[PDB]
Amino acid sequence: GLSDGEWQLVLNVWGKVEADVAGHGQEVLIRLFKGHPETLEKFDKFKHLKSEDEMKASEDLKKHGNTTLTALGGILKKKGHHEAELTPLAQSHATKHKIPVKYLEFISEAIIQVLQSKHPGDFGADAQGAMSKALELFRNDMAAKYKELGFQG
């Protein structure tokens, strides 16, 4: 959905995340939990973290962040011919974890805020715009799969 050029920007900033997937993954879930505390409640092993000090110290949080970003990089690498990899994710999220589309917007924001915080240099006006279109396509495709399995509610 982006131009070839926009995908390139997207894969190029993602190259930075790939050099530290779990430290970027940890910081994204801390930003999401801190930003929207209600999301935390969706996680049984984190539901009890009461502060950012406890979130930073959690081994499990760091793992789950690695898991989350590893899965999103597999989707981003397919540029948009990503139906196959998105499916299973829409399936588990809609049906087993029961994650509203709204929360996919909250995590897209937490992603942009960590790339901006960790790579101010590299994540300039054009990289930010290309990653925001890429996360919006992701969330639109997830919403599409949700309304299909017949959720969104």
Q: Does 103 interact with ligand HEM (rule: CB under 6 A)?
A: yes
Cα(84)–Cα(106) distance, rounded to whole angstroms?
Answer: 23
Residue 36 counted as an annotated binding residue: no
- Minimal distance in Å, beta carbon 131 to ligand HEM? 12
Name the segment binding ligand HEM (CB under 6 A); options: 16-24, 99-107, 117-125, 143-151: 99-107
Q: Is 76 in the site for ligand HEM (CB under 6 A)?
A: no
Assess 104 for contact with ligand HEM (CB under 6 A).
yes
Q: According to the binding rule CB under 6 A, does residue 87 interact with ligand HEM?
A: no
Q: Are 98 and 8 in contact (CB under 8 A)?
A: no
Asked whether position 67 contacts ligand HEM by CB under 6 A, the answer is yes
* SS3 annotation, 100-137: CHHHHHHHHHHHHHHHHHHCCCCCCHHHHHHHHHHHHH
d(CA 44, CA 135): 26
CB 76 within 8 A of CB 14: yes
| Neighbouring C-alpha atoms within 13 Å toward the C-beta of 100 | 9
Rounded-to-integer distance, Cα 28 and Cα 62, Å: 10
Render the burial of 49-75: b for 16+ CB within 10 Å, e for the rest: beeeeebeebeebbebbbebbeebeeb
Determine whether the annotation assigns residue 48 to a binding site.
Answer: no
Which x/- pattern over 46-65 shows residues binding ligand HEM (rule: CB under 6 A)?
A: --------------------
At its nearest, how many Å lie between ligand HEM and the CB of residue 64? Answer: 6
114 binds ligand HEM (CB under 6 A): no
Annotated binding site for heme b: 93
Annotated binding site: 64, 93
Give the residues lining the site for ligand HEM (CB under 6 A): 39, 42-43, 67-68, 71-72, 89, 92-93, 97, 99, 103-104, 107
Annotated binding site for O2: 64
